[PDB]
Amino acid sequence: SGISLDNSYKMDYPEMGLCIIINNKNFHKSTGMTSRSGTDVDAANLRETFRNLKYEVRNKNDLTREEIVELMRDVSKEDHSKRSSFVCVLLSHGEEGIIFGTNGPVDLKKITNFFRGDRCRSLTGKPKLFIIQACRGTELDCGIET
Amino acid sequence: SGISLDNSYKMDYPEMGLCIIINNKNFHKSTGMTSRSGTDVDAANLRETFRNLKYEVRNKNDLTREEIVELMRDVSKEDHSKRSSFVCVLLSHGEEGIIFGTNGPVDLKKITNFFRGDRCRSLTGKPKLFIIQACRGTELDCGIET
Amino acid sequence: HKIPVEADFLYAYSTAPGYYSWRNSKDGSWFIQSLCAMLKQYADKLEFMHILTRVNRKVATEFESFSFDATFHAKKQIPCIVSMLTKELYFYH
Amino acid sequence: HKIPVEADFLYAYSTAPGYYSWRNSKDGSWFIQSLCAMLKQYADKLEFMHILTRVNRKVATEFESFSFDATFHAKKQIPCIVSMLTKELYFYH
């Protein structure tokens, strides 16, 4: 065939891939974390948006730190051979490098490590997208008038 | 005039802007930091590359932590009104969030803060690029066979 | 013969390192609102990084906090695109 | 009426967060070598994020460490593009 360039990811596999949405709104009282009002609006918006991009969306609500790790591990163990990519959306409280389960923190690195090129072979060479809606600290941007 | 879209930065100012290259090869013995052999090759490559992009390149070699902060402060105090952008290249030893002067560390945030939209008015709305060639920790990527 | 194990990852952060992330109880978070709007409008036209750049501009220009608490009033937000991708990404083909 | 003070910044890191950054005493660092090569070849043709993506692929595929020390042998590297930019950036006009 003619000249072949590989500047774009192959996104024509039979399936676009999974879109895992973790929506944490209610947190255990003991954590002292407040409810995240309006997060359901985000969760629904994402479900529809990615549905239209042909992603197999799976919504999970109010997951403990244990359940988040278990979910990610299980998902990374699936056969993504026929999938073009992987998308994970995290909606919760957070700190730099951390996402909160309903009962405690989860290091983002622990979550993403399951998908490393050497740990999830069926996703090796494929785009792995993590969308994070959570604080990364307490700093506030005062902005500048333009 | 016809329809006007602003999807691209205005890069047609009289000047493209400054390209400050900080090349730290030799470090004070007391730090116990080794010389960065070959860094001059990088420094020269960048000088020529950005020269061809019409940037006003300024090379600085072996700067102490004090000199780095002073340089950045002074540069941020210049009038960049006629410049399209700003580029700063850092070549040195480093750790996560840190770049090393020849005699000690410098928080990257301290360096970039001088250029905040509210602290460097002549660069507000203009692209500020920081290119960092330095370690961000000690982790090694074992890679995966494809 | 090998690729980095950290390659082909894209982290679309709602905010810059060390910063707070804003949410509107009625409309949803500033970031997700903007991300979905831009994907809906440009997913069949622009490369992913360019879509995310539009998201950065939308969040940066169209949102500002309002609070009775001076500490949290009139604040802004800029998302943070972190790419370890090795190719351009288009949702269409 | 305002923009974030952290907006319009682009951080082109030679390596991923927490990782070592490789350098060749003779050819220079893997990242800078690749960055200059891609800017020389594409600065008058591609948007900056796309140029940096090419840099990611070049570093990721064309470089691998060789060391007598097993600890540092056969290692790889992926650069890390961190964008807080609000518009596309072309070095030409």
**Strands A98-101, A104-107: parallel, antiparallel or unpaired by DSSP?**
antiparallel
Q: Name which of B21, B109, B121 is nearest B71 in CA terms.
A: B21
Residue B90 has a CB neighbour count (10 Å cut-off) of 22
Measured distance CA(B94)–CA(B88) in Å, rounded: 16
- Backbone phi, psi, residue A114, to 5°: -60, -25
Measured distance CA(C16)–CA(A10) in Å, rounded: 30
Cβ B125–A146 below 8 Å, yes or no? yes
CATH of the domain at C93: 3.30.70.1470
> Distance of CA C62 to CAs A43, C32, C51, C53, D73, Å?
21, 13, 16, 14, 49
Cβ D5–A145 below 8 Å, yes or no? no
Cβ D18–B8 below 8 Å, yes or no? no
Helix (H, G, I), strand (E, B) or coil at A18: strand
Cβ A142–D5 below 8 Å, yes or no? yes
Task: Specify which residues D23 forms β-bridges with.
Answer: D29
Which residues 16-75 in chain C show a CB within 8 A of chain A?
Answer: 16-21, 23-29, 31-33, 35-36, 39-40, 43, 64, 71-72, 74-75
Nearest to B146 among C1, C6, C54 (CB): C1
**B135 catalytic residue (yes or no):** yes
Cβ B7–D88 below 8 Å, yes or no? yes
Query: Which residue numbers of C have CB closer than 8 Å to D's CBs?
Result: 1-7, 16, 19, 47, 49-50, 52-53, 56-57, 60-61, 64, 74, 76-88
**Measured distance between the N- and C-terminal CA atoms of chain B, rounded to whole angstroms:** 53
Identify whether the C-beta of residue B102 lies closer than 8 Å to the C-beta of residue B29.
no
* C57 interaction partners in chain D (CB closer than 8 Å): 86-87
Method: X-ray
The upper half-sphere exposure of residue D4, i.e. CA atoms within 13 Å in the direction of its Cβ, equals 31
- Residue ranges with strand state E in chain D: 2-3, 9-13, 23-24, 28-29, 80-83
Residues listed for chain D: 93
List, in order of start, the domains of chain B with CATH numbers: 1-146 (3.40.50.1460)
**Strands D28-29, C2-3: parallel, antiparallel or unpaired by DSSP?**
unpaired
Identify whether the C-beta of residue D86 lies closer than 8 Å to the C-beta of residue C56.
yes
Residue labelled with tokens 């008038």: A145
Cβ D18–B16 below 8 Å, yes or no? no
Nearest residue on chain D to C15, judged by CA atoms?
D84
Residue A105 has a CB neighbour count (10 Å cut-off) of 18
Nearest to A125 among B121, B143, B146 (CB): B146
Measured distance CA(B55)–CA(B51) in Å, rounded: 5
- Backbone phi, psi, residue D14, to 5°: -70, -20
Measured distance CA(A86)–CA(C9) in Å, rounded: 10
Kind plus residue range of the DSSP H or E element containing B20? strand B15-23
Q: How does DSSP assign B46-106, residue by residue?
A: HHHHHHTTT-EEEEEES--HHHHHHHHHHHHTS--TTEEEEEEEEES-EETTEEEETTEEE
C23 is in which domain, residue-wise? Answer: 1-93
Helix (H, G, I), strand (E, B) or coil at A117: coil
Nearest residue on chain C to A25, judged by CA atoms?
C25
Cβ C1–B144 below 8 Å, yes or no? no
Nearest to C53 among D3, D53, D86 (CB): D86
Nearest residue on chain D to A143, judged by CA atoms?
D4
**B93 catalytic residue (yes or no):** yes
Q: Name which of B140, B22, D12 is nearest C4 in CA terms.
A: B140
Which residues 83-142 in chain B show a CB within 8 A of chain D?
Answer: 85, 91, 94, 96, 112, 115-119, 123-142
**Helices C48-62/D48-62 angle, 10° precision:** 130
Resolution at which this structure was determined, Å: 1.9
B100-132 core/surface letters (b: 16 or more CB in 10 A; e: else): bbbbbbbebebbbbbbbbbebeebbbbbbbbbb
Lookup: tokens for A4: 């072949």
> B140 CA to chain C: closest CA distance, Å?
10
> C69 CA to chain A: closest CA distance, Å?
13
Chains contacting A (3 or more CB pairs within 8 Å): B, C, D
Total tally of structural domains belonging to chain C: 1
> D72 CA to chain C: closest CA distance, Å?
14
